[PDB]
Amino acid sequence: SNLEKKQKKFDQMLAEEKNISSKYADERDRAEAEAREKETKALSLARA
Amino acid sequence: SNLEKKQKKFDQMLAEEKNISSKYADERDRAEAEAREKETKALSLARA
Amino acid sequence: DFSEEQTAEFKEAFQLFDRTGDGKILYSQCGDVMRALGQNPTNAEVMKVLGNPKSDEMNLKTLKFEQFLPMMQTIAKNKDQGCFEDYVEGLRVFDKEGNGTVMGAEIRHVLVTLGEKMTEEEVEQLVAGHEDSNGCINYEELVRMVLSG
Amino acid sequence: TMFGEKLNGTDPEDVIRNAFACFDEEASGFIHEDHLRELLTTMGDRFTDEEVDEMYREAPIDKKGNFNYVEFTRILKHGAKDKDD
Amino acid sequence: VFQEFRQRYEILAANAIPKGFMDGKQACILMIKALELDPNLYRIGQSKIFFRTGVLAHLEEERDLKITDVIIAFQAQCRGYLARKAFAKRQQQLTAMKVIQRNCAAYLKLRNWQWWRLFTKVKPLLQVTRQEEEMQAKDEELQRT
Amino acid sequence: QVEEMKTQLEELEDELQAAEDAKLRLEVNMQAMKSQFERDLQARDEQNE
Amino acid sequence: QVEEMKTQLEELEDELQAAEDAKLRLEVNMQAMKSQFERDLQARDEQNE
Structure with missing residues (x-):
């Protein structure tokens, strides 16, 4: 029964953790992007 | 039966692990940016 | 990056850690020197630095001073910065009577219950630096001392 | 002056004695041969252990590996000499 | 309880x-x-x-x-402090010792036989320093009395 | 002029070498005598013990 | 060469003020030695107390 109460609170954690993990994916994709443009512009100006 | 429902929750664990795989792709992208930054450091020494 | 003063500091550390050849740098050596040169966070940065959990060859763990410089920057972006309020609350929870009557045994116990542990001579060495009596400190003096480097 | 050009980068016995007291706390002058070579040849200004061996084939080292320094300091200075004519 | x-x-x-x-x-x-x-x-x-x-x-x-998390952070601070202290003490000791003593050792070993003969005519130095040495030793034995 | 400037070269280099070396080794002696003083401290500590 | 040795002379002057800085460090070191002398005296008086 305490595993069942763990089950319901774990389902709420399922929802919230899906949301937060999607947020982590989004923010890390934005970071990887902005980094990519940073090194592209740096290397382009450097090679020129 | 409720443990089989827990196994469905573990399928949602698999879903969040797919999200973590997205973070893993971000990890390769940031590692590539890191290596390109090392190249940029050597390049900047050459510029100096 | 800053001026060439930090590059000069890294160069003099490079010639300082010149054992078994000045040119090559061991990741253990670079980690030690970067930690001591004012960067506390070193625990889990091995994966964030190498990109490979490979930690099998002690003799040849390749690193060069050239790529060493951006490594210092991407570490020094200060990925984590804690402050003593969390530390003192954790210790006062760990504390028993609110004053620290005899703290010597239980601190050793709590440090040997952690999986990621490396040294015992440091555990016996911590007695130096005002930590002399039978756990006389209520941890404020030792927190102040450790937060001075 | 032709002796003057022969003296440079050296100091009297006091500083060498103090340094030898510093490096090992016991100050007994038990400079073990492995410890001696590790502390001398390895770190600092890199130089060859083969030329370091002149400190071994000539200077009298104490037995069982340890190397006394007070007699070494005296012979380095004018206080003592290995032999006489 | x-x-x-x-x-x-x-x-x-x-x-x-x-x-x-x-x-x-x-x-x-x-x-x-x-x-x-x-x-x-x-x-x-x-x-x-x-x-x-x-x-x-x-x-x-x-x-x-x-x-x-708390113990990880605290031990990280402790490791940093230990690294700083040991590194600084080490480095200063190695600099002082090795620089000075290797310089002196090289200077003596090159001149151990670069001017061996002139370093062997130093025999009368002990004979001529005896007056000053005796006066000094008299002073310190007087203060030890 | 070159004679006098290299005269200051030799003089200042010799004086700086001597002074800095004596200073660093004197701080080494500072630590050493502090260590002997603290050994005397533990000697009095064991007498009290 | 005239301005070359002028620049070298200016550099020598700069290292000269570096030499007086080393002298100033000499006096601060000596006063530190005496200072820790009375600190040790006070410490031994404390153990006597």
Whole structure:
């Protein structure tokens, strides 16, 4: 029964953790992007 | 039966692990940016 | 990056850690020197630095001073910065009577219950630096001392 | 002056004695041969252990590996000499 | 023991429960409802509460789970401090010792036979220094008297 | 002029070498005598013990 | 060469003020030695107390 109460609170954690993990994916994709443009512009100006 | 429902929750664990795989792709992208930054450091020494 | 003063500091550390050849740098050596040169966070940065959990060859763990410089920057972006309020609350929870009557045994116990542990001579060495009596400190003096480097 | 050009980068016995007291706390002058070579040849200004061996084939080292320094300091200075004519 | 019970268990979950006020049975009841465990797993008392075998097997590891971040951070600070101290002491000692002493050793060993003969006519130096040495030693033995 | 400037070269280099070396080794002696003083401290400590 | 040795002379002057800085460090070191002398005296008086 305490595993069942763990089950319901774990389902709420399922929802919230899906949301937060999607947020982590989004923010890390934005970071990887902005980094990519940073090194592209740096290397382009450097090679020129 | 409720443990089989827990196994469905573990399928949602698999879903969040797919999200973590997205973070893993971000990890390769940031590692590539890191290596390109090392190249940029050597390049900047050459510029100096 | 800053001026060439930090590059000069890294160069003099490079010639300082010149054992078994000045040119090559061991990741253990670079980690030690970067930690001591004012960067506390070193625990889990091995994966964030190498990109490979490979930690099998002690003799040849390749690193060069050239790529060493951006490594210092991407570490020094200060990925984590804690402050003593969390530390003192954790210790006062760990504390028993609110004053620290005899703290010597239980601190050793709590440090040997952690999986990621490396040294015992440091555990016996911590007695130096005002930590002399039978756990006389209520941890404020030792927190102040450790937060001075 | 032709002796003057022969003296440079050296100091009297006091500083060498103090340094030898510093490096090992016991100050007994038990400079073990492995410890001696590790502390001398390895770190600092890199130089060859083969030329370091002149400190071994000539200077009298104490037995069982340890190397006394007070007699070494005296012979380095004018206080003592290995032999006489 | 009641005090031991607080020091061992309430350290896990004390926040979100009113605190400060002290009472023998009442504080124990508040802690029990904070744990919301089975009354069948223990029996109340006036001095000590007697539990069964399996209660301790699911409460200790929560402390391990929670205090983990704090101990990681604290040991990181300790390792940093140790590294700084040892590194600085090391480096200063090696600089002083090795620089000075290798310089002196090289200077003497090159000149050990670069001018060996002129270093061997230093025999009369002991004979001529005897007056000054005797006067000095007289001074220090006078102060030791 | 070149004679006098290299005269200051030799003079200042010799004086700086001597002074800095004596200073660093004197701080080494500072630590050493502090260590002997603290050994005397533990000697009085064991007498009290 | 005239301005070359002028620049070298200016550099020598700069290292000259570096030499007086080393001298100033000499005096601060000596006063530090005496200072820790009375600190040790006070410490031994404390153990006597």
